[PDB]
Design a protein around this ligand. Sequence first.
Ligand SMILES: CC(=O)N[C@H]1[C@H](O[C@H]2[C@@H](O)[C@@H](CO)O[C@@H](O[C@H]3[C@H](O)[C@@H](O)[C@@H](O)O[C@@H]3CO)[C@@H]2O)O[C@H](CO)[C@@H](O[C@@H]2O[C@H](CO)[C@H](O)[C@H](O)[C@H]2O)[C@@H]1O
Length: 241
Amino acid sequence: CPSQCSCSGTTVNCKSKSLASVPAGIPTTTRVLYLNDNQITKLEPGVFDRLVNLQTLWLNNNQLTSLPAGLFDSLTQLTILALDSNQLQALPVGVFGRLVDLQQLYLGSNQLSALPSAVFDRLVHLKELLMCCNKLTELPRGIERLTHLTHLALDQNQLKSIPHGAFDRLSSLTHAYLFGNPWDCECRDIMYLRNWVADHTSIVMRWDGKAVNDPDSAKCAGTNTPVRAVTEASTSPSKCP
Ligand SMILES: CC(=O)N[C@H]1[C@H](O[C@H]2[C@@H](O)[C@@H](CO)O[C@@H](O[C@H]3[C@H](O)[C@@H](O)[C@@H](O)O[C@@H]3CO)[C@@H]2O)O[C@H](CO)[C@@H](O[C@@H]2O[C@H](CO)[C@H](O)[C@H](O)[C@H]2O)[C@@H]1O
């Protein structure tokens, strides 16, 4: 056990310990690793290579700005990875490529404006993808193939539309967060999101400390009128960015 942390069973608790770096002494037997709520500014390559039994890894609420390539490649049994509330500016290609059993991925509250094109291609069992509070301008490629998603959080980004058909195979969705985006309702491309929301009013959620069903929470930029109320006649292909 790291001297700054407490350990019990296969759980290592390094949460809220004012840590500036990942401490030594985490047993290779560890299955749950709390490193959240610290001041970790970077993760060294190979730091997780020894921890092949991890199933849940909490790196949220730190000061991470980048991740080295291959950082997680040994964590083949990982099912939850939390990276929210950091300062991640970009991700390397294949950063999640080996996390084939991952079920929950937290990326909200970073500085991401795009993702590598194949970032989710191997996450065939993913159920929750929460990426609020970044600066995304397009739906990341690959999300349309995460057919097992129950939770998809895209709120508080910079999305203007959703590519046609992107949500149609996400038939297990129960929670979709779309508020806080500047949806461009004069552009003809908004019609897919409009049509999809109108058919899935029960799964569009707002957030006041918790999920609250609100299909009007996806709002048009400027008028702040509901996206699902847009008429096609009011839109035009020539009014798109
Ligand atoms: C990894 C994760 O669960 N992230 C979500 C985040 O989790 C916070 C929540 O569990 C609260 C519950 O009290 O605890 C916070 O942790 C505390 C900790 O308990 C304290 O002892 C001390 O250490 O400080 C930390 C941090 O303050 C967890 O961080 O909760 C937020 C919402 O508050 C979620 O973000 C929302 O996600 C929604 C989709 O699910 C939606 O997009 C919404 O807009 C987001 O705000 C994190 O996903």
